[PDB]
Nucleic acid binder design. Structure first.
Ligand code: VO4
Ligand code: VO4
Lengths: 322, 322, 322, 322
DNA sequence: TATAACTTCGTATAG
DNA sequence: CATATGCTATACGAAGTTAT
DNA sequence: TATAACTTCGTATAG
DNA sequence: CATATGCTATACGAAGTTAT
DNA sequence: TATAACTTCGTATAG
DNA sequence: CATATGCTATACGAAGTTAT
DNA sequence: TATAACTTCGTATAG
DNA sequence: CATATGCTATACGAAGTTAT
């Protein structure tokens, strides 16, 4: 019990060992679990397996996604494991119910969704539509989409790019040094190469924004309504705004998304990453090169990305016709 | 103690944590193991290492495949793990004997089998023999085989398709939404498009069968001796019957099965997935594309199917023939 | 102590879990160690750390290779670990002296040797010389070298090939099923494709030898004095004889090897596996394709095989002389 | 406490189990750790996790690189493991801070450094600037730079070359036999061939220095201020002097380096290895041949060197520029 | 019975 | 050999050494 | 006596 | 870049075997 | 005082 | 997401079932 | 009335 | 094929913020 308090304090003390998003969800889940405990007369900590079981069953009846329910279970597991206590999932009651909730939801039609693909044909369409615009916001957005599609970088990684991270190949192509991604923490990092065309889009953005005035400036910054950019070395353009760029670009071409409240009605932050992975598969690029493009280490994760390859233009339709 | 009894109640209560197919195999292995134990004066639960070892040697002596023997071990392992008891696999005796058995069976020439391929050449031959057939039975079966080859869905998934899952592409093709995916993250996607030719076969079956009188009806239904189809929203055609279609089609072209009692002497449930994979390889479709077309995540599953194709003979052959 | 006895009994009773070669070397090491023990008044089992250290240092003074000394240590470790006793290498005296012996010997000039490469140029040369021969012995030997080079199979794997393991591709190339290799024991196994030229060499061997009389005959067999092959389903051509084909083929081209006592003066069993790896590196074959050819799982083992690439015709000399 | 005492004595007895460079670092880290402990009133041995944690945070604050902090942890780990003690790394507190330190340093912009490349263009330029010199020192330095670039040998390996390691091919080229390999299994091979031009550079040095008088003489030796070489069979040129050659050559061309005490402002001992790897990549030499040319075993070391060449820009760049 | 062409075996060493 | 887990090298400023 | 041209050393960090 | 673990192969001289 | 074009936030869900 | 580890499908002969 | 054409089932094995 | 572990990311509606 004194040990438990020690263990939690040690975890809190070295806070920055974890992603800030891990903490955010720990706290979000604890809040949800503690609120449910209070209303149902249960002790929130240590958590009893039968209580956790009941709580997961309640999340299922709320109609939450399997992955949501797993996230709640998982945060509860971590809180116990890192306290030095048994995990809820160490008991059959919890581990079996989680299995059950997954099978039942899937059998009822649930499957995990994926960002709408922003693909080469989309990039070309957007390029031809927007390339001539001299609005600073459009110059920015096109450079952003170019990088997103060319490097497959996640939006948080793109948001973190500083001017000093940009260098050049002998042949003129931009190279973006990346040191931290979702899966990589390294002082060696990776370089992401941009094509000659995407290099030009980025230079146009660097040129009208003036972000190069200080190499500590983040590459991307906000653009106020007077078409003026606000470079900054301390605030990133939010990943929310990067999502917004994808959504506004989709809206430009296809109009307003309907009102059904479903996710991925329009392009979102992961859309170019999914799109480029699909184009590479279709073009016959070798697995190891797809891996390198996306910073992936195994084939399963690649399959996760290309799982929704368009069927109508797929291999089997083309083979059967013509 | 009373712990195991509680663990087993939790298993029963949340029995939907496992597929019906998993339970049926657990019970089947349990009957075999208990029968053998009763015969040999051994306690069947908890399983003792020396006893499991002898049982596994008896399974080998019986002529069971390595993978069958693994199933028996795996099922006993699961019963024990979920009971909170030691696994048979976690012992020196069982570990050694499995190593021995694998080695001996491989040297004795035991081979893993796979479905006889149902390929484009086969599909075309059957088309040209059956497409004009008046028979309702034949119109159904051709549409089945076309969907099987075109989509690479498994028989259970084809049996699940409902009329309401079908829509039309702008190209005029049929598009089949997957109502229930095999897993939460559906490696094969959420829809399957049919070529123009296979769309025609399916349209034909729909119009002749009357299944579209009700959107909730399963696409496929039984057809009685009088050639009248019996559409239904509550009863699927069995996977057994779908295998019978593959077998009956093979019998049509090659006559009755050889008598060796081997598996895969005629086409079976898996035959069109193996065939389509082969046809895609022949056409130079990349491995990741082949894999998502059929929903595979393990490279070696697909390699087993395509490794005897000239296009897949490897670098040394290419090097020598240069 | 009763437990130790039971542990060894269990190891010996499933002796087939291990390779015949592992047992062969266990016994060879035990008699060396037991004999040294006898002569030095030590107890051979359990082995005391200070005595093992003394023994290792004596192996070193005998001028034995680092890999040999590691083999002796390793065999003692296994004997102990599978007794349920502490390994000699669990003590500092032993693990430390092993590192020391290896460091001192390397510092003094010792490096691991490798089979002399049998490469494409060597194969073409031998083929050009021998392809016109009508002696059964030559036809065999040419088919053997072709398989060895085309497939990289180790000689034991080549010795186990049976006639029934051979099939064909649609384009007419031979395929060889292999179920057991040094690193793989699988009922799925692996398929090894032959070029058209190599395929034609094996066909010639099959037709002159009559091995095809029984699909259970080994592909290669002894050929007596009179030029008559003696096919068998019961005895393999020994790996020693297969080494002899390599050594004899080397003598045919370069005459007698000198009298260094050194290994690898002439081609041996591993020569074509090494030579094929090297030709693939030099031709720019991708790492995955090299891996597939050798049935290797990682890059380090590939580097092990290509480590002695000729430097006189290597990349640096060529670059500098341009 | 007597076990630990014996364990350390065992470590002393088999000193030579580790490189002198490993011991030098163990002692250096122990000095730093014990000095910090005295200051902070902590017990230095056995090291407690809370204390090691505070120490690691102190190393971070000092501005030491991640890899340096790992060296300190690693050496404490070894000392504890070979003592029979709990390793600082095997504790919650140390695990958590290392994870935290890694993230924060990468986020602060810490970047791993890399030797300044000494490429073909540098080598040619140096040759044409210096080839008119008749000074013994210059002639040596030129021969040294040629060997460094041509062979990709490490400075310690170049310092160990004896005249008797050098023989001649039928091409007229010098061939350097590697007397002492880096490892038992030598990734770089057992010999290095010189181009004709670099052979000429080395002939000139041998002729002016008199090293060939005794074949046991090290190839390179010191040259005092009166331009007189001092051949030796028992004394090597230090690796520090070889670094000094690269440094002085850079200074001659570009003048004195920066005040900003950064690393790699001038060429150093690794420069020719990095340079030669880059020239090979530019020529289209495959990664594996590059790796064996420099004795590298890990693909990502090489990739670090060449990641900014247009040749290595990846699949997405290829797709977009098509 | 004489020998080509193997096999078997042990120590040794590579993968 | 497929896997598991750190050791062993270079970098470089400074200070010591030895023949000019 | 100044100095070139090293070697030795200890800490920092890459291979 | 390194070496460890717990194997499983090949190397080769020498001596034994058997159908000509 | 609007307003475009964001940022912040908390929950939900994918990778 | 990188990593570690078993579950969930089809195969098929046989025995039942139900509307012709 | 047999009977086509299924369905259900249990063990074997591939995905 | 499959799903668990222990994370670490994105999705997005809502509501709040600041140079114009
Ligand atoms: O035998 V090593 O591939
Ligand atoms: O973001 V997942 O590659």
């Amino acid at each position: 019990s004194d040990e438990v308090r020690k263990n939690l304090m040690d975890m809190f003390r070295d806070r920055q060992a974890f992603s800030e998003h891990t903490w955010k969800m720990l706290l979000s889940v604890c809040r949800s679990w503690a609120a449910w405990c209070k209303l149902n007369n249960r002790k929130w900590f240590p958590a009893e397996p039968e209580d956790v079981r009941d709580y997961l069953l309640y999340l299922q009846a709320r109609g939450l996604a399997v992955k949501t329910i797993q996230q709640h279970l998982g945060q509860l597991n971590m809180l116990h494991r890192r306290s030095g206590l048994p995990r809820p999932s160490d008991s059959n009651a919890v581990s079996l119910v989680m299995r059950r909730i997954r099978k039942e939801n899937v059998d009822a039609g649930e499957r995990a969704k994926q960002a709408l693909a922003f693909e080469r044909t989309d990039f070309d369409q957007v390029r031809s539509l927007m390339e001539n615009s001299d609005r600073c916001q459009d110059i920015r957005n096109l450079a952003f989409l170019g990088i997103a599609y060319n490097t497959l970088l996640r939006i948080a990684e793109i948001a973190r790019i500083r001017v000093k991270d940009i260098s050049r190949t002998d042949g003129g192509r931009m190279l973006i040094h990346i040191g931290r991604t979702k899966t990589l923490v390294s002082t060696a990092g990776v370089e992401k190469a941009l094509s000659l065309g995407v290099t030009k889009l980025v230079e146009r953005w660097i040129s009208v924004s003036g972000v190069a005035d200080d190499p500590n400036n983040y590459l991307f910054c906000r653009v106020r309504k007077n078409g003026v950019a606000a470079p900054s070395a301390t605030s990133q353009l939010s990943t929310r705004a990067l999502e917004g760029i994808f959504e506004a670009t989709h809206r430009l071409i296809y109009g307003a998304k309907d009102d059904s409240g479903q996710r991925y009605l329009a392009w979102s932050g992961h859309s170019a990453r999914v799109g480029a992975a699909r184009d590479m598969a279709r073009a016959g690029v070798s697995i190891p090169e797809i891996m390198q493009a996306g910073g992936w280490t195994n084939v399963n994760i690649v399959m996760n990305y290309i799982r929704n390859l368009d069927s109508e233009t797929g291999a089997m339709v083309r083979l059967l016709e013509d």
